[PDB]
C-alpha cells in the first residue's frame, strides 16, 4: 500500500535495522552513492539477511549462502534488473585487485574483508558477531 | 596550440588513419560509445601504434609490446586517468568469458580474437596485415 505501511510492515519483520547502513557509511566515507562493499556490510549486519549472507565466525570472513539473492537485491538497489551473480562476481574481482576483499580459497562463495575495517568502522569483527548472534 | 594545428601535426606523423576507427565501427554495430574490443581494433589497424601493439602474423592474434601505453590511451579515451594494465586485464577477461578474445598459452600479453571478425569487418587477417606492413 502506502509508504507509511511499507515502513510499518517492514519494521514488524525486523527489517531496516542494520548496524552499518550502506547509506550512512557512504556519507561517512564521502562516496555519494553506496558502493558494493558497503552494501555487503549492510546485509552482513542485518539480522533479516542471515539466511542468504552471513558471517562465518572467523574475523571479517563471510559467505553467500544464496549468491543469486544477493545479486537480486543489489540489482533492486542500483536499478540494474539484469543484475546476476556473474556480473556481481566480475565486480568482486576488481575488489580483489585492490586488496579490499579476498576469496577464501577452499570454500565456495566465501570471502573476507582484508582492508582495515576495524580502524574504519570502530567495531571489531567479534563485536558485530555478538550483536548479530553469529554461530 | 589550436585545433587546426593539433590535426595538422598529427597528420604529419601519419596518425588518425586507422583502417578500423573505433567510432566508425561503433556506428556500424550501433553500440554508441566505443567498447574496448573496438578500441583495440583501432590501434591494431593504426600504423602509428605498431610500437606498443601490433599483429603477430597468425590470423587474429596480437601482442601488447607496451601494455602500459595501451592502458594509458584507453584511460584518456574514457576519462579514467587512473587506468592501468591490471584494470585493463580484467577488462580482457570479460571478453574471454564471452569467447570474443582468448589468451595465447605460455605467452604474456598475447591474445587472439576468436569471434568471426571476418564476417563482421569484411576483412581477412592477411588483408589487414598487408595493408599494415606486418612482419
Amino acid at each position: 500500500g502506502t509508504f507509511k505501511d511499507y515502513v510499518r510492515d517492514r519494521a514488524d519483520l525486523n527489517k531496516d535495522k542494520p548496524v552499518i547502513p550502506a547509506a550512512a557509511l557512504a556519507g561517512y566515507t564521502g562516496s555519494g552513492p553506496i558502493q558494493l562493499w558497503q552494501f555487503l556490510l549492510e546485509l552482513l549486519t542485518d539480522k533479516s539477511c542471515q539466511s542468504f549472507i552471513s558471517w562465518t565466525g572467523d574475523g571479517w570472513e563471510f559467505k553467500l549462502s544464496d549468491p543469486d539473492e544477493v545479486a537480486r537485491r543489489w540489482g533492486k538497489r542500483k536499478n540494474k534488473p539484469k543484475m546476476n551473480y556473474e556480473k556481481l562476481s566480475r565486480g568482486l574481482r576488481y575488489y580483489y585487485d585492490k586488496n579490499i576483499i579476498h576469496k577464501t580459497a577452499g570454500k565456495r562463495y566465501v570471502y573476507r574483508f582484508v582492508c582495515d575495517l576495524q580502524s574504519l568502522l570502530g567495531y571489531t569483527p567479534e563485536e558485530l558477531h555478538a550483536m548479530l548472534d553469529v554461530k | 596550440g589550436t585545433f587546426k594545428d593539433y590535426v595538422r601535426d598529427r597528420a604529419d606523423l601519419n596518425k588518425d588513419k586507422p583502417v578500423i576507427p573505433a567510432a566508425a565501427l561503433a556506428g556500424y554495430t550501433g553500440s554508441g560509445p566505443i567498447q574496448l574490443w573496438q578500441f583495440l581494433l583501432e590501434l591494431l589497424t593504426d600504423k602509428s601504434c605498431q610500437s606498443f601493439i601490433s599483429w603477430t602474423g597468425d590470423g587474429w592474434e596480437f601482442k601488447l609490446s607496451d601494455p602500459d601505453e595501451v592502458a594509458r590511451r584507453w584511460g584518456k579515451r574514457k576519462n579514467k586517468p587512473k587506468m592501468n594494465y591490471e584494470k585493463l586485464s580484467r577488462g580482457l577477461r570479460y571478453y574471454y568469458d564471452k569467447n570474443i578474445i582468448h589468451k595465447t598459452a605460455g605467452k604474456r600479453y598475447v591474445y587472439r580474437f576468436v569471434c568471426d571478425l571476418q564476417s563482421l569487418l569484411g576483412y581477412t587477417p592477411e588483408e589487414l596485415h598487408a595493408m599494415l606492413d606486418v612482419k
Binding site: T29, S31, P33, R90 | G91, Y94
Partner: peptide, 16 residues
C-alpha cells in the same frame, strides 16, 4: 584505506 571508483565497461557504476 581508500575506495576508488568501481566503474568499468564490464561492470558500470550507477549514479542516477
Amino acid at each position: 584505506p581508500s575506495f576508488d571508483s568501481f566503474d568499468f565497461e564490464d561492470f558500470p557504476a550507477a549514479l542516477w
